[PDB]
Amino acid sequence: MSILEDPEFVKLRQFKGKVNFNLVMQILDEIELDLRGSDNIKTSIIYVYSSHLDEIRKNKEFYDMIAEILQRYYKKIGIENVNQLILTTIKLEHHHHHH
């Protein structure tokens, strides 16, 4: 159970996220819920990314790298798990208001 094998992930860690936790949680959720019923995560990416183009272009580095990782690791650990790990990647532990 890792997510460290891929260089895209470390780059996400480097950027610290800086994205809307709430929206990414929904992005991940949105592809997840589709992929739970469907079988093609690439296609699941298409809907959500085309629907949320504004945010996708906003955090294009983030959304490019995660889209790769999401598909890449869903086959290995599962999309549920990857989505959670991505949230973990954008979240600082507990030092926010006092950081």
3: number of Cβ within 10 Å: 22
Structure-solving method: NMR
Decide: 90 and 24 in contact? Cβ < 8 Å. Answer: yes
Decide: 69 and 10 in contact? Cβ < 8 Å. Answer: no
CATH architecture of 1-99: Up-down Bundle (1.20)
Decide: 27 and 20 in contact? Cβ < 8 Å. Answer: no
Torsion over CA of 83, 66, 10 and 20, rounded to 10 degrees? -70
Q: For residues 8 and 93, give the distance between their C-alpha atoms in angstroms, rounded to a whole number.
A: 21
29: number of Cβ within 10 Å: 12
What residue type is 47 in one-letter code? Y
The 8 Å CB, 24+ separation contacts for 1-7 are: 1/77, 1/81, 3/69, 3/73, 3/77, 3/82, 3/85, 6/69, 6/72, 6/73
Angle (CA) 14-17-21 rounded to 5° is 160
Q: For residues 16 and 46, give the distance between their C-alpha atoms in angstroms, rounded to a whole number.
A: 25
5: number of Cβ within 10 Å: 9
Decide: 86 and 24 in contact? Cβ < 8 Å. Answer: yes
52: number of Cβ within 10 Å: 16
Expressed in percent and rounded to 5, the helix, strand and coil fractions of the chain are 70, 0, 30
